[PDB]
């Protein structure tokens, strides 16, 4: 728990200035949030989610994983273009069934799906 504006001023009851009241309180705020930040780092140090978000090695992995998986989705998109799944496909509710068939055809190709695997959608 953090101290309010009144509680900090109760400590220094001697030379109570007008301008220097906000000086020492904001210095307390920065040094309180310094320790609270430091206590969080030591608490959630070894956890994977925190490691993954900030650690040099682990952040290097997730950029490499995501960029690899993102390239798989691009090669799927470019395969759908040249094969011809976006030919007579408009983004309207009238062609809602055609969009669902396309998205399933995309997800098939994402999972290493062959041209034979696409035949079930017919």
């Amino acid at each position: 728990v953090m101290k309010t504006f009144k509680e900090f001023l109760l400590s220094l009851d001697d030379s109570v200035d007008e301008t220097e009241a906000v000086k020492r309180y904001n210095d307390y705020k920065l040094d309180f949030r310094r320790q609270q930040m430091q206590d969080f780092f030591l608490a959630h140090k070894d956890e994977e989610w925190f490691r993954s978000k900030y650690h040099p090695d682990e952040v290097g992995k997730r950029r490499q994983e995501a960029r690899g998986a993102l390239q798989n989705r691009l090669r799927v998109f470019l395969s759908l273009m040249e094969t011809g799944w976006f030919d007579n496909l408009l983004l309207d509710i009238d062609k809602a069934d055609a969009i669902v068939k396309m998205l399933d055809a995309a997800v098939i190709k994402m999972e290493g799906g062959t041209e034979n695997d696409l035949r079930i959608l017919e």
Binding site: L30, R67, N116
Partner: protein, 319 residues
């Protein structure tokens, strides 16, 4: 050969996954159930003690009800998973206001979609020319074939103009997981059971005449929602970093060397790393940098690990 239903997958969902539980532990648990594919984990939520929500997905040809009941009441590090059978996506193709098909908004949406792809392709380095070899300054990235000759259509309801727009949005949605018409991203889609789940779409033609005030109102509302999706990771100021107490790389390395150069007696020095005794202060200094060259750089990583946390503006913290 036998054609498979790769688009179809039944899956579990997990409510309580403590942050100390690794991804590898959940994969290791769910691997023994045959027809296993992959585990997804949500961004942890600070209000609920940084616990995570999970999604274990399987091949469709498997009794998901049996797997759920079998997995029921198994606790990784004394933390109950409480799995349930995840439902199928029903309302796949949602819609939004029909005004979007109007020709003035279509032109505006091509401008914005092209701007989104330009940003997202550059950020991810998606079209890298020969990614294995190193990047020279004279090297350029490969062009996106959708972005070729776009402003020709902008300058000088139309079907051919919409076909250009749809290829931009279909790219955004299939590749980067950006649902354009809803103004939202599904960032962790490739791990989740439904790889490319929900898409939003232009509604039916409006009944009444489309007012020009309502056209400008939509375009104002649309761009205000899109700009949050182009968010830069906000780094704090270098004064604020030094005020909050950013650690220096080589200072901690110097603190590491001095701490591992202890004096036993007169002309007798020892390091805890190896345990070889030397007869000088800078004898142990030259020992550590040569023999334990991997150890001193591991400290530099732990410094950057603390600094990169500090650098972030919206840090994870207690509410």
């Amino acid at each position: 050969c036998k054609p498979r239903p790769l688009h179809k997958t039944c899956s579990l969902f997990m409510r309580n996954i403590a942050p100390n539980i690794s991804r590898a532990e959940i994969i290791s648990l769910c691997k023994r159930y045959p027809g296993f594919m992959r585990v997804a984990l949500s961004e942890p939520q600070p209000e609920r003690r940084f616990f995570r929500r999970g999604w274990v997905t399987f091949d469709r040809s498997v009794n998901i009800k049996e797997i759920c009941w079998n997995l029921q009441n198994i606790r990784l590090r004394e933390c109950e998973l409480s799995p349930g059978v995840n439902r199928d996506l029903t309302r796949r193709v949602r819609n939004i206001n029909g005004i979007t098909q109007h020709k003035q908004i279509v032109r505006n949406d091509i401008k914005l979609a092209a701007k989104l792809i330009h940003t997202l392709d550059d950020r991810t380095q998606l079209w890298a020319s020969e990614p294995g070899t190193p990047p020279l300054p004279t090297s350029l990235p490969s062009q996106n074939p959708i972005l070729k000759n776009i402003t020709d259509y902008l300058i000088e309801r139309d079907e051919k103009l919409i076909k250009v727009l749809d290829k931009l949005l279909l790219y955004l949605r299939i590749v980067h997981s950006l649902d354009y018409y809803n103004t939202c991203e599904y960032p962790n889609e490739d791990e989740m059971p439904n790889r490319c789940g929900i898409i939003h779409v232009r509604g039916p033609m409006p009944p009444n005449r489309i007012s020009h005030g309502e056209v400008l109102e939509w375009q104002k509302t649309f761009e205000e929602k899109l700009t949050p999706l182009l968010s830069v990771r906000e780094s704090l100021s270098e004064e604020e970093a030094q005020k909050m107490g950013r650690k220096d790389p080589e200072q901690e390395v110097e603190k590491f060397v001095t701490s591992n150069t202890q004096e036993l007696g007169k002309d007798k020095w020892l390091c805890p790393l190896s345990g070889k005794k030397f007869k000088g202060p800078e004898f142990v200094r030259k020992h550590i940098f040569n023999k334990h060259a991997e150890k001193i750089e591991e400290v530099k990583k732990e410094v950057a690990f603390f600094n990169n946390f500090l650098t972030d503006a919206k840090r994870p913290a207690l509410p």
